[PDB]
Design a protein around this ligand. Structure first.
Ligand SMILES: Nc1nc2c(ncn2[C@@H]2O[C@H](COP(=O)(O)OP(=O)(O)OP(O)(O)=S)[C@@H](O)[C@H]2O)c(=O)[nH]1
Ligand SMILES: [Cl-]
Ligand SMILES: [Cl-]
Ligand SMILES: [K+]
Ligand SMILES: [Mg+2]
Length: 332
């Protein structure tokens, strides 16, 4: 139950209007270049990256120099989603999977239609979230300290930069208020339960990202339901069905809760009806790497939620994306 083994890694979504820098932020954290790789210059699928709590500590050290801050989660599974208006469905699915979220707003553009759509998803599903005010490097005469906490860098800026920041921030708060949300700059926020925290960030310079990370950890630990900190009954969802060399037809699955084990008899839904099979191989990508991206896999005898995993099993042809996955126990 509330044991410290059986701890669960929560799920965080990233949602936002097109080209606001979701994938870019993820690339900056991962130290990867998925964004350049994307065909057509757009994100068209749900992406999963697992972040061990160690990496989060290391990346939040600058805003946690004293070391006061307490990390209770073992890790965090982070879900990239499409921003283009066409993919409402995938945003809906991703949102359906997450426990908490990051809503990315381009500080230069403010709230845009898919920002509003995402806001409806978050509000309707009562998902705790913070807002990343991205692309602060686009403030006129912004001067950069790489991977710095926002407040430290902001203190260094000239008064013109600070003025323009406060203008754009004020406009964004007005916009959120028009959408029925009270929002606050994160260190100015006194009602964490009811007011949305705003984190200024740059995906290019990495500034404000430590603040964002420590804030999503905070979301997990103080706004998310406490039971979700621990593993309960198994829940898993199929993201994708693809043919992989030497593994045949495989499925990309989000393990939301519970534990998946090699040899588990599983059932999922195909076009015609149910598919019953056995997990032959339980795979994850390397930590800090996309499940979608092709790389050599790490084989597991078991995997604990929440994680993005690739399952190799016979007879997965016809599996449907978005279908839940169940484990069948030996006795009837
Ligand atoms: N100057 C600046 N440019 C950025 C920043 N973040 C992203 N960009 C740029 O904006 C463009 C969009 O980045 P991208 O990561 O594809 O956004 P996205 O939100 O994932 O886009 P999509 O999934 O809705 S198609 C890229 O060209 C990227 O270089 C930032 O913090 N500063
Ligand atoms: Cl919230
Ligand atoms: Cl990657
Ligand atoms: K893009
Ligand atoms: Mg993207």
């Amino acid at each position: 139950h509330m044991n410290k083994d059986n701890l669960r890694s929560p799920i965080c979504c990233i949602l936002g209007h097109v080209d606001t820098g979701k994938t870019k932020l993820l690339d900056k954290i991962r130290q990867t270049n998925v964004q350049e790789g994307e065909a057509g210059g757009i994100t068209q699928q749900i992406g999963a990256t697992y972040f061990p709590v160690e990496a989060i500590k290391q990346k939040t050290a600058v805003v946690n120099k004293d070391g006061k801050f307490e990390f209770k989660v073992p890790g965090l599974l982070i879900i990239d989603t499409p921003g283009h208006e066409s993919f409402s469905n995938l945003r809906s699915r991703g949102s359906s999977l997450c426990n908490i979220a990051i809503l990315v707003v381009d500080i230069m553009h403010g709230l845009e239609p898919q920002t509003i759509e995402s806001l409806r998803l978050l509000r309707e599903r009562k998902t705790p979230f913070v807002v990343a005010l991205n692309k602060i490097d686009r403030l006129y005469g912004w001067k950069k300290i790489e991977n710095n906490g926002f407040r430290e860098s902001f203190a260094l800026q000239n008064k013109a930069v600070q003025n323009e920041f406060r203008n754009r921030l004020d406009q964004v708060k007005l916009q959120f208020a028009e959408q029925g949300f009270n929002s606050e700059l994160f260190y100015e926020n006194k009602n964490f339960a009811r007011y949305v925290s705003l984190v200024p960030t740059s995906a290019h310079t990495g500034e404000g990202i430590p603040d964002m990370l420590k804030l999503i950890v905070q979301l997990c630990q103080e706004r998310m339901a406490s039971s979700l900190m621990y593993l309960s009954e198994l829940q898993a969802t199929v993201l994708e069905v693809k043919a992989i060399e030497g593994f045949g037809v495989t499925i990309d699955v989000i393990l939301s809760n519970g534990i998946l084990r090699e040899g588990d008899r599983i059932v999922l839904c195909g076009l015609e009806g149910p598919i019953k099979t056995n997990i032959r191989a339980l795979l994850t990508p390397a930590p800090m790497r996309e499940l979608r991206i092709k790389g050599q896999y790490i084989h597991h005898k078991e995997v604990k939620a929440a994680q993005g995993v690739k399952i190799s099993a016979p007879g997965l042809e016809g599996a449907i994306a978005g279908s839940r996955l169940l484990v069948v126990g030996p006795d009837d």
